[PDB]
Amino acid sequence: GSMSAEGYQYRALYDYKKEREEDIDLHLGDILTVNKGSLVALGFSDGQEAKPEEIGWLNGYNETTGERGDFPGTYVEYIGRKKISP
Numbered sequence: 067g068s069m070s071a072e073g074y075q076y077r078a079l080y081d082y083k084k085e086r087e088e089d090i091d092l093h094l095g096d097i098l099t100v101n102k103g104s105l106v107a108l109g110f111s112d113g114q115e116a117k118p119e120e121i122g123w124l125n126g127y128n129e130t131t132g133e134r135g136d137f138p139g140t141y142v143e144y145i146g147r148k149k150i151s152p
Contacts (some may be wrong), residue, residue: 072099098126107125124136
């Protein structure tokens with residue numbers, strides 16, 4: 067209805083394979099989505115949500131594969147956000 071994303075999004079940069087049961091399979095064009103106003107999803111309290119370069123592990127889900135797990139903040143690229151960061 068709002069005609070917008072249901073949280074913050076990221077875009078995969080390179081194909082990564084999962085080596086841990088805690089991680090999931092990552093491919094190209096695969097966009098990840100997180101929460102919208104509960105950054106405590108990660109236990110974070112900065113409010114940055116834009117420079118994965120310093121962020122360690124991000125937890126989200128890949129709608130394309132309906133999968134859910136954790137991924138590093140170096141193989142993806144922050145792209146889009148809700149109005150929580152003017």
